[PDB]
Amino acid sequence: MKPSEMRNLQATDFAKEIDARKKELMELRFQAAAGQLAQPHRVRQLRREVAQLNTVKAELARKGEQ
RNA sequence: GGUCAAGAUAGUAAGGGUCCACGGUGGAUGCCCUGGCGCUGGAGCCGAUGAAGGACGCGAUUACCUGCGAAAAGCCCCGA
């Protein structure tokens, strides 16, 4: 989610922890339009995760090279 | 009482007038402020690591605005 158990992983996993959510974030987005989205928040969350799932990855891009 | 004659005179308002009562219209007036004006002082550059100012977007529902910008009404960190 954010702690040292987020970065904890592989760069590729970051992607996996990305390209998988936006796979949920889709089926969700579909549901909505199809009517049944009972997890309005899920959306916002899943989303918020992807944010972190990059901000971090991005924090590395400078720590270990400057 | 009456009839006849001669006189005189009022009343009704279709509509109007003045005044009062009560209303409608309309926004003056008074009180108020979520908005302005001036002077004093403070502060005084921004931009190819891409401005100024904008287009299209982001929301469970979003047309206007606001904040942002696909990491999209927000993401990390430090403090409070």
Tab-separated table of C-alpha atoms (C1' of nucleotides) in Angstrom:
chain	number	residue	atom	x	y	z
A	1	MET	CA	0.000	0.000	0.000
A	2	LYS	CA	2.842	2.392	0.822
A	3	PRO	CA	5.263	1.237	3.575
A	4	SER	CA	8.594	-0.513	3.029
A	5	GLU	CA	6.418	-3.453	1.993
A	6	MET	CA	5.491	-1.572	-1.180
A	7	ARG	CA	8.987	-0.835	-2.502
A	8	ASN	CA	9.877	-4.154	-0.953
A	9	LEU	CA	9.217	-5.712	-4.363
A	10	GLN	CA	10.623	-6.022	-7.880
A	11	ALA	CA	10.346	-3.181	-10.377
A	12	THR	CA	8.462	-5.639	-12.607
A	13	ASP	CA	6.146	-6.432	-9.709
A	14	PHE	CA	5.425	-2.734	-9.422
A	15	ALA	CA	4.134	-3.035	-12.997
A	16	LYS	CA	2.270	-6.213	-12.006
A	17	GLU	CA	0.929	-4.259	-9.064
A	18	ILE	CA	-0.123	-1.736	-11.685
A	19	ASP	CA	-1.238	-3.476	-14.882
A	20	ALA	CA	-3.408	-5.671	-12.650
A	21	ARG	CA	-5.296	-3.002	-10.769
A	22	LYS	CA	-6.183	-1.049	-13.910
A	23	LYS	CA	-7.520	-4.427	-15.008
A	24	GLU	CA	-9.858	-4.353	-12.031
A	25	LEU	CA	-10.380	-0.626	-12.418
A	26	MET	CA	-11.779	-1.577	-15.836
A	27	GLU	CA	-14.154	-4.366	-14.900
A	28	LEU	CA	-15.287	-1.902	-12.243
A	29	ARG	CA	-15.733	0.981	-14.643
A	30	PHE	CA	-17.720	-1.458	-16.778
A	31	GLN	CA	-19.952	-2.573	-13.928
A	32	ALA	CA	-20.763	1.044	-13.198
A	33	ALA	CA	-22.001	1.753	-16.735
A	34	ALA	CA	-23.766	-1.608	-16.649
A	35	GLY	CA	-25.186	-0.630	-13.272
A	36	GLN	CA	-24.133	-2.521	-10.126
A	37	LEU	CA	-21.068	-0.528	-9.020
A	38	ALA	CA	-21.732	-0.870	-5.302
A	39	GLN	CA	-18.087	-0.181	-4.426
A	40	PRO	CA	-17.850	3.496	-5.462
A	41	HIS	CA	-14.862	3.794	-3.145
A	42	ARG	CA	-13.081	0.768	-4.560
A	43	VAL	CA	-12.595	2.860	-7.655
A	44	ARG	CA	-10.997	5.808	-5.848
A	45	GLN	CA	-8.875	3.340	-3.809
A	46	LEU	CA	-7.636	1.107	-6.620
A	47	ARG	CA	-6.867	4.396	-8.296
A	48	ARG	CA	-5.007	5.874	-5.335
A	49	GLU	CA	-2.947	2.698	-5.275
A	50	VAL	CA	-1.711	3.084	-8.843
A	51	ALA	CA	-0.609	6.576	-7.846
A	52	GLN	CA	1.618	5.207	-5.099
A	53	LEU	CA	2.559	2.309	-7.377
A	54	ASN	CA	4.513	4.880	-9.342
A	55	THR	CA	5.411	7.754	-7.051
A	56	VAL	CA	7.492	5.192	-5.203
A	57	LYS	CA	8.940	3.499	-8.266
A	58	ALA	CA	9.790	7.089	-9.242
A	59	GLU	CA	11.452	7.793	-5.892
A	60	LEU	CA	13.928	5.031	-6.769
A	61	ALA	CA	14.792	6.674	-10.115
A	62	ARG	CA	16.916	9.125	-8.111
A	63	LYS	CA	18.026	7.034	-5.156
A	64	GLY	CA	20.789	4.801	-6.446
A	65	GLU	CA	22.243	7.175	-9.013
A	66	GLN	CA	21.340	10.714	-7.930
B	1	G	C1'	-112.552	62.626	1.076
B	2	G	C1'	-112.761	62.313	-3.963
B	3	U	C1'	-112.419	64.488	-9.609
B	4	C	C1'	-110.923	68.191	-12.327
B	5	A	C1'	-107.300	72.514	-12.987
B	6	A	C1'	-102.838	75.411	-11.842
B	7	G	C1'	-98.525	75.438	-9.553
B	8	A	C1'	-94.176	73.477	-7.255
B	9	U	C1'	-90.849	69.647	-6.070
B	10	A	C1'	-88.225	64.938	-5.004
B	11	G	C1'	-86.666	60.070	-6.142
B	12	U	C1'	-84.181	56.152	-9.567
B	13	A	C1'	-77.541	56.378	-12.025
B	14	A	C1'	-76.138	53.489	-17.578
B	15	G	C1'	-71.749	55.481	-16.384
B	16	G	C1'	-68.829	59.389	-13.926
B	17	G	C1'	-66.793	62.654	-9.700
B	18	U	C1'	-64.505	63.689	-4.544
B	19	C	C1'	-63.270	61.537	0.153
B	20	C	C1'	-62.566	56.971	3.337
B	21	A	C1'	-61.685	51.727	4.029
B	22	C	C1'	-59.408	47.524	2.079
B	23	G	C1'	-56.565	45.349	-1.377
B	24	G	C1'	-53.124	44.337	-6.279
B	25	U	C1'	-49.447	46.144	-8.884
B	26	G	C1'	-44.419	48.130	-8.325
B	27	G	C1'	-40.063	49.064	-6.119
B	28	A	C1'	-38.667	54.023	-3.723
B	29	U	C1'	-37.410	54.371	1.540
B	30	G	C1'	-34.959	52.604	6.216
B	31	C	C1'	-31.805	48.918	8.353
B	32	C	C1'	-28.295	45.522	6.990
B	33	C	C1'	-23.676	42.547	4.176
B	34	U	C1'	-21.410	38.031	2.098
B	35	G	C1'	-18.985	43.707	-2.540
B	36	G	C1'	-16.248	48.041	-3.971
B	37	C	C1'	-13.022	53.025	-3.758
B	38	G	C1'	-8.751	56.077	-1.940
B	39	C	C1'	-4.359	56.493	0.982
B	40	U	C1'	-0.426	54.598	3.954
B	41	G	C1'	2.851	50.939	4.212
B	42	G	C1'	4.596	45.995	2.290
B	43	A	C1'	6.004	43.493	-1.683
B	44	G	C1'	7.827	43.633	-6.847
B	45	C	C1'	9.352	39.953	-12.222
B	46	C	C1'	7.653	34.933	-14.814
B	47	G	C1'	9.606	31.715	-19.120
B	48	A	C1'	12.569	26.254	-23.503
B	49	U	C1'	14.189	22.042	-16.688
B	50	G	C1'	8.836	25.476	-21.656
B	51	A	C1'	5.561	30.905	-18.854
B	52	A	C1'	1.523	34.208	-19.592
B	53	G	C1'	-3.258	32.586	-21.086
B	54	G	C1'	-5.926	28.533	-22.993
B	55	A	C1'	-8.164	23.232	-25.431
B	56	C	C1'	-9.752	18.408	-23.924
B	57	G	C1'	-10.117	15.700	-19.692
B	58	C	C1'	-10.376	13.481	-14.047
B	59	G	C1'	-15.167	12.713	-10.294
B	60	A	C1'	-20.343	6.581	-7.772
B	61	U	C1'	-24.113	10.653	-9.855
B	62	U	C1'	-21.413	16.428	-12.644
B	63	A	C1'	-23.978	20.448	-16.903
B	64	C	C1'	-21.344	25.625	-14.147
B	65	C	C1'	-17.294	26.662	-10.972
B	66	U	C1'	-12.913	24.966	-8.133
B	67	G	C1'	-8.330	21.792	-7.816
B	68	C	C1'	-5.929	18.917	-10.400
B	69	G	C1'	-4.284	16.444	-14.667
B	70	A	C1'	-4.393	10.431	-16.600
B	71	A	C1'	-0.209	8.804	-10.828
B	72	A	C1'	-5.867	13.711	-12.653
B	73	A	C1'	-11.247	17.440	-6.660
B	74	G	C1'	-5.433	14.372	-6.275
B	75	C	C1'	0.471	10.844	-5.252
B	76	C	C1'	5.629	10.944	-1.277
B	77	C	C1'	7.992	13.089	2.447
B	78	C	C1'	9.031	16.861	7.058
B	79	G	C1'	6.527	19.860	10.303
B	80	A	C1'	2.158	21.838	12.490
